[PDB]
């Protein structure tokens, strides 16, 4: 599910065939390579790509491996990162934020004011020191989490994940 690595720099002339060969040479379980081509000449790539592995284990072993100095792929010029699902979506994706580390003085209203900046809230539900924040659309949750995570609310650094759906 988390099975894709981001690769920050590859030679922009290399085809998807050649990227598969190169990275398949030095890691196990490589299963796909997702390339974007320079729209002005479809034959070149945009200088980055995604590596897909059969599972998250494999992708995880591969990342460690490519990050070790133990082996070199086209110079190791850029970083190899986990892919960010926020960044490349894809189906009812989750528009509920789970917020923890809520200071004593934080109310449902204060939560509404702070999180309303990013899009229409459907409901704020505060518990003891954590809260559920229902956004009308996923894009509002994505923005709220990106901008608010780790931020100070009433003296407390709040921590934000997408909620686990009860389904």
Q: Tell me: do 125 and 162 sit in the same domain.
A: yes
Per-residue DSSP letters for 112-150? HHHHGGGS-EEEEEE-SSEEEEEESSHHHHHHHHHHHTT
Query: Count of domains in the chain?
Result: 2
Q: Tell me: do 8 and 50 sit in the same domain.
A: yes
Q: Tell me: do 64 and 106 sit in the same domain.
A: no
Q: Tell me: do 20 and 43 sit in the same domain.
A: yes
Q: Tell me: do 77 and 4 sit in the same domain.
A: yes
Kindly report the number of other CB atoms within 10 A of residue 84's CB atom: 10
CA distance 34 to 15: 11
Q: Tell me: do 94 and 65 sit in the same domain.
A: no
Domain coverage including residue 162: 90-167
Q: Provide φ and ψ at 73, rounded to 5°.
A: -120, 125
CATH number of domain containing 144: 3.30.70.330
Give me the resolution in angstroms, 1 decimal: 2.6
Exposure string (b/e) for 20-48, b if CB count within 10 Å is 16 or more? bebbeeebeebeebebeeeeeeeeebebe
């Amino acid at each position: 599910s988390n099975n894709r690595l981001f690769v920050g720099s590859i030679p922009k002339s290399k085809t998807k065939e050649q990227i598969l060969e190169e990275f398949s040479k030095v890691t196990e379980g490589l299963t796909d390579v997702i390339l974007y081509h320079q729209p002005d000449d479809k034959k070149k790539n945009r200088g980055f790509c995604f590596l897909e592995y059969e599972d998250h284990k494999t992708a995880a072993q591969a990342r460690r491996r490519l990050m070790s100095g133990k082996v070199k792929v086209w110079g190791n010029v850029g970083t190899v990162e986990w892919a960010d699902p926020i960044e490349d979506p894809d189906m009812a994706k989750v528009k509920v934020l789970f917020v923890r580390n809520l200071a004593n003085t934080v109310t449902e209203e204060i939560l509404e004011k702070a999180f309303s900046q990013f899009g229409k809230l459907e409901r704020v539900k505060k518990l003891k020191d954590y809260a559920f924040i229902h956004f009308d659309e996923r894009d509002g949750a994505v923005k709220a989490m990106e901008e608010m995570n780790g931020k100070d609310l009433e003296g407390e650094n709040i921590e934000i994940v997408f909620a686990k759906p009860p389904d």
